[PDB]
Design a binder for this molecule. Structure first.
Ligand code: HEM
Ligand code: HEM
Ligand code: HEM
Ligand code: HEM
Ligand code: HEM
Lengths: 309, 309, 309, 309, 309
């Protein structure tokens, strides 16, 4: 009966990520537009319903204490800035996240055009990326991106909250991280060195052998084993973006998870690293620019918001 | 375990609606063809299975008392002709409704060709429309049509009968209404006047503001609030048709619902109107030509029909 | 919670069937690659995820007694060679079956390239067919092939094992039969004679009338009635193959079922035939070349194999 | 025998416009990359040849006097900045124009990535727009854009230079103009007022009646009659761009023509206006930001450049 | 007025190559079927005309002296077997070549089925390959294949014979070479070594720098400069094939050219090699299995064959 937000969707060829911070004293203006979002999605994306326009509304901690009364999600907190040994993962202020995805750029652009002008003057858009998609789902590093997202049962228990928090049954936690990795050192790097970086191959994306794969690789550090033996997986819709006029080539990481402890332990395996391997090899090239922790509610939660405190 | 008929399907670019009345004393001839319909669908539509040929067999009240013994659907009755103040909603006799939908016209045409000639001589086809589909799901009025159909849970409880009638768990009620609205007055009418008619915009189909939207608009009158606060929604596959040789430009309305009280209250909000607003603004231009109330059974019900009385 | 293998998938325009026998003393080499198969599928098919690359790993009886300890599937046995009156259904040795299916030939070819070279030297590929797909899902006989596969509930209870064997809840049994039917006698045969062979029409694939359809037709002999009145259905992904350089025109039959008693009774209705009709009319033209009985496990069963005996 | 650059191509769903100015003393570095451009196009766009990756190299006046010796195109000059009565058409310095167009964003992005890093350090990219494409070829104004481009003979004599300049037989002249029109006043404007602005309708893009169409409309001012009676047409690939984080909604105008006198007379009919109508109605909303006049050579001219002076 | 055979066609996702030798005394039987080929192409490929079924009939030297009277093509000769220093290029007997290409495998298979059974008993099919196509036009080596085929004027003068032989104005010469390159040594070879082999990159197929590219690379040896300065190009539709049951992974090379001196000088640059570089680096891995020189006539030449001698 709790219908979740469309996070369990395939990767789309175009995507728009919008991190907008809410201005002071403009609570009820966003409280108007928050039930209107699914109406705008069904209004716009029904023009070409075979484009699969799907918005993912997400709300941070500050926007939760401002906008909503009653309960609170249990692990919803501001994104812990990870000041590691060499690489730092910053956290810019962002109240709400609009994650838009469809088959083409225009319908995402029009949904975002109608989104901020349903709450005109209430928000300033802090982060504006138009994430496109490479040839066979690659990123700018050249490796195929996101091939280990689960499906079915191993995905709905990976993302959707059950009754471990029954007031928010259904719903995820989001970690956006806008990277801006350089290509000057990455392109001069050779391919087998880059496969030591990633942990899988580049052309065919075969995972490497367990003894051949180094301990500080990305696919080596991001896999998380529990003590019972089950592995915890997240679903990430990482879409590359970039502007050649500034020479920017970045991959907008965005990870959906049942609890932010899993994503934060992955980020601890990357930035803080393992106690053997204290650095992740992709962070030698990728520097995070933005960061934020958010919460997806159900679409019923946007349909029936709790009253404004 | 009751598999419903494929009503929960997206809008297809071509559609064929058949309202055929059963001749006198030809009961067992249709009783032969009624289990054969899903076999014909799987037979024809498997040629190009990425055309999604899907028939929706529907049965009226007279064909229920003739064809089937045992129980009866609780609210199945002949379509109440709504003789309002100015606009009248007539009800031509039609026993069964064949609703066909697929990606192209030809496979719907061939399924309909095999449908009446599986029961040859038993029926006369009263109403023959070949509903095509406009650019971005528009109708002949120019507005995008059917953008507020629900999905998922809010659709299956909107259409499929639970155990409030347990002998027909799964199954809908159909209201066909073949409109023949004129374009001479509609085209000379200006756009903003037409947005007062509809209640949403024309180009981008944004719903208007609640104070800006007039009370006699279509989207204003057709949304139904209950006393608990939930809204009752129906699913409609309205497909435009037309013949320019007669100058006909019509939209074949067809609405699927869990109970005909909801659709009939929508028709009462349109023709009879609200006690404040006694006329719906689209009925100034749209005159209904046909009308009928039908019942979708399950496909198991066509597989296992009750014995012929 | 048991996730089955992707057998409930639509027919794809290209398919690769691999019947590879395991060499002596190479048990642990295949035991390495058997958890790696879903990883290779998610690795390769994520390049163009709208190609739907889906492998179906299947294991015969000999490979079960060699590879796996613990329990055994209840009806898993070597494929009983049917030496009928005139037509014989042979059974070549084959340990495991790799059934690959996607929208194009190349990604199936690359998955098969990575499959045998994940277990290099451990297997010899006995049977190598590249099954393509005709115009509207036809076969080389000219008839539309596989139009009576069930969907939904009538398919999951047709294929997936419940708790009648609770140690293998979810999982099917496979009957491959590589036919090599001649076209010289079939093409000189007239159309209506061929519709007596099949039991359905050729151009539009309408099923024939029950009195018009002969008793020795294919669609007449292969439908199985039980004593309670329900019919037992299987799901078959029959893909045509062929080599004109040898003049070969064959249809690689492959049938998935909940229990091999159903498929074996269909084969008894074909080769042994009915006690009235002892021959199936398509076996006058189709001679089986290969044969094998296999078992699909769950993908969890490949993820968590029982320990190697 | 002179093969022109691919200007006679249909409008593509994604486009990248690059206006890069050449740094001082970096002439031979661009002289290396200028024959390499068609090689890079055939190298990258052959991956998915059904994406139609097509670059249009264009060279301004300064880059012509720097890069090329020998002759000069007859009307090639710096873009005359039109300081009208109210609206001004500026001209930023830009040496060369890279016009990229294909079915998707990624292959244009990769061609542009390889374009500046074939001449690394020689150029600074002044203008960086990623032009996407709306629903039915619309722009951000909502009107269908570019429906009056000619085809066939009326297009090749509209764009390609014959032997009126025989040293550059084949080749066009380009007028880029990056507009940044506001949507706050345009959206509050009503639709029939906007049809007075454009001169055609908005939903169906029917051209208005000749008496109904005002004299200061866009389609009224931009059609140019000669004294013999023929009309001079240009081909424009106007692609919308925009950034909602700055609130930018612009249409990157780019017009290809046989001679810049035609495009400049169109710009004089817009900014300077007619002596009756001195303002074009779309310039009330559209303010030009950039501007430049360039020259397309043949691809043979890039294959065989004249020697560097 | 001479319409050439459809050699100037894009690379198709499926292809069938058929090298059939004509039996002794079966001249008039092939002389019947040779005008019937374009009729069979228009007959079969018009079913789905958006599959682009296109046959390329080719005739060797022996079939020319047997089948046709009158003139002879000037350079038509049996394929000179190149017995180099280490690699040998053999030449199996093959009279005619049937090159079939379309969007899918089935219509090529059906055209080939109707081709040999229009001349039943007159031919034996010596070579039977079903060439499929990799992800982004790659081959089994992993490199993108055929990205330097010309287009337009530089292609029609590269392939079609003018009036240097006016009796066969229009028409090409074909060099088929079925390679069977091993993957065991190629896969263990590293990427940059393979880019020394090819001469271009692997992932993005950028051509290497002229000083970085070695002299014995494939792209280094196969480009042919003339003494006037123009380069002679051929058009090749190289399609990969293979059978994993034998472990075969081959690329069916097929090259169309205006004169076989160009293709033979390319083969001399490969097998015999340059006098500096006597071996081509891809021939370390690729061993030719078959070989043949053929002649494409015009389709008018098949429509109006010269009388049988
Ligand atoms: C710096 C930007 C990043 C890039 C370019 C990147 C790219 C990739 C690539 C290419 C892979 C291998 C293919 C696949 O399995 O997805 C991968 C794996 C993965 N990435 Fe990332 N990634 C980035 C950051 C992150 C972050 C910040 C997280 C989570 C905190 C993350 C989570 C994962 C996980 C969980 C896997 C799969 C590990 C396994 O297969 O179980 N990535 N990433
Ligand atoms: C006269 C022919 C009709 C036309 C041309 C028409 C067209 C439209 C259009 C353009 C909309 C707005 C877009 C959308 O929300 O669907 C709409 C809304 C709707 N129509 Fe109709 N309609 C017609 C008759 C009917 C009838 C007879 C019914 C039911 C008895 C009906 C039920 C609805 C409902 C329920 C809505 C949506 C209200 C809301 O959004 O909740 N319509 N129709
Ligand atoms: C000799 C090669 C075979 C060919 C060419 C072939 C082809 C066909 C065709 C054309 C049909 C009718 C269309 C459709 O309903 O699928 C059909 C029906 C069927 N075939 Fe086959 N078939 C072959 C062998 C088999 C085998 C070996 C089995 C199972 C043991 C089998 C099981 C069935 C079943 C169950 C049906 C449907 C009967 C009904 O509709 O309920 N077939 N086959
Ligand atoms: C300010 C940005 C501009 C926008 C949004 C715009 C948009 C449009 C639209 C919507 C049309 C009508 C549909 C069609 O015929 O193309 C049109 C027509 C046209 N535009 Fe533009 N345009 C712009 C600027 C320009 C400029 C700067 C030129 C050339 C100097 C130009 C040349 C034309 C021409 C020649 C026509 C067609 C007139 C006729 O049909 O013969 N436009 N434009
Ligand atoms: C052994 C099997 C062969 C393979 C796998 C192969 C593959 C390739 C590849 C990957 C390229 C680079 C991409 C492209 O430019 O096409 C290439 C280039 C080329 N190949 Fe082949 N090739 C083979 C044999 C041949 C033969 C036998 C000929 C002609 C006699 C030939 C003629 C060419 C030419 C002319 C080029 C382009 C050189 C230039 O760019 O101007 N190839 N081949």
């Amino acid at each position: 009966a709790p219908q979740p937000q469309p996070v369990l969707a395939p990767l789309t060829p175009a995507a728009v990520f919008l991190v907008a911070t809410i201005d002071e004293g403009q609570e009820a203006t966003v409280y108007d537009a928050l039930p209107d979002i699914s109406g705008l999605v069904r209004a716009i994306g029904f023009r070409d319903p075979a484009k699969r326009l799907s918005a993912i509304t997400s709300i941070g901690s500050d926007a939760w204490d401002r906008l909503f009364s009653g309960p609170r999600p249990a692990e919803l907190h501001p994104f812990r800035e990870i000041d590691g040994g060499r690489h730092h993962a910053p956290a810019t202020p962002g109240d709400l996240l609009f994650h838009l995805r469809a088959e083409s750029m225009d319908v995402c652009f029009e949904l975002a055009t109608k989104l901020v002008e349903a709450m005109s003057g209430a928000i300033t858009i802090v982060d504006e990326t138009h994430g496109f998609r490479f040839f066979d789902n690659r990123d700018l590093m050249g490796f195929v991106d996101g091939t280990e997202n689960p499906d079915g049962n191993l995905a709905v228990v990976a993302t959707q909250i059950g009754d471990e928090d029954p007031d928010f049954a259904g719903g995820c936690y989001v970690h956006v991280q806008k990277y801006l990795h350089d290509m000057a050192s990455w392109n001069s790097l050779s391919v087998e060195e880059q496969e030591r970086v990633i942990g899988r191959t580049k052309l065919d994306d075969i995972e490497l052998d367990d003894d051949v794969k180094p301990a500080n690789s990305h696919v080596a550090l991001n896999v998380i084993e529990d003590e019972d033996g089950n592995e915890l997986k997240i679903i990430r819709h990482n879409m590359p973006f970039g502007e050649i006029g500034k020479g920017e080539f970045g991959t907008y990481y965005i990870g959906y998870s049942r609890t932010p402890s899993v994503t934060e332990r992955m980020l601890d395996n990357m930035f803080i690293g393992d106690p053997p391997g204290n650095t992740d090899r992709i962070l030698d090239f990728s520097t995070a620019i933005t960061g934020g922790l958010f919460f997806t509610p159900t679409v019923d939660f946007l349909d029936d918001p709790p009253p404004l405190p």
